[PDB]
Write a protein that binds this ligand. Structure first.
Ligand code: HEM
Ligand SMILES: O=Nc1ccccc1
Length: 153
């Protein structure tokens, strides 16, 4: 696919639709995560000691929303420029993931949870052309964070 002017216009459009409801899309996102792998729960300070995923936890919201923002920006940056660029932030991201005890085999958990989440968010507009475009953008961004973890470990 590469990222045509038309495929990029499709991810933008679809991220806008996600941000449009953070407390919902974020709590959805944590549940799809815990469906795909329940053990993951002891990772999160705000989920530990709990029984269910808190639904108005500020810490939870603020953190999951940052995740999706970062995938979208990665997709424009691929249509424009042709690539995803590794900055200070991505590098600190990788430190924190290591302290919390996160590994690589964790990443398809969070990708499926995200493709599924965007499938749910765009509904009938969904096209092959679009799945292809978020897949490209997540894969290309994961490639970069993993890189930074490995580096913090
Ligand atoms: C491209 C894919 C990913 C992106 C963009 C991303 C982004 C983030 C960000 C931005 C934060 C910190 C939020 C804050 O400090 O304000 C964070 C924290 C965290 N992330 Fe990820 N993430 C990704 C994949 C993963 C995976 C695969 C896991 C494994 C389950 C994970 C587990 C965690 C944990 C446990 C924390 C600490 C939360 C705490 O104890 O309060 N992340 N991530
Ligand atoms: O997937 N990484 C996450 C970031 C912040 C909070 C929870 C998860």
């Amino acid at each position: 696919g590469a990222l045509t002017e038309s495929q990029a216009a499709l991810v933008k459009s679809s991220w806008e639709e996600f941000n449009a409801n953070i407390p919902k899309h974020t709590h959805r996102f944590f549940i799809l995560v815990l469906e795909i792998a329940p053990a993951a729960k002891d990772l999160f300070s705000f989920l530990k000691g709990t029984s269910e995923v808190p639904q108005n936890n500020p810490e939870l919201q603020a953190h999951a929303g940052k995740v999706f923002k970062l995938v979208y920006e990665a997709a424009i940056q691929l249509e424009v420029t042709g690539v995803v660029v590794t900055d200070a932030t991505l590098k600190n991201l990788g430190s924190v993931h290591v302290s919390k005890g996160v590994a690589d085999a964790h990443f398809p958990v969070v990708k499926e949870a995200i493709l599924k989440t965007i499938k749910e968010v765009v509904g009938a507009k969904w096209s092959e052309e679009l799945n292809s475009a978020w897949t490209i953008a997540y894969d290309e961004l994961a490639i970069v964070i993993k890189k930074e973890m490995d580096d913090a470990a």
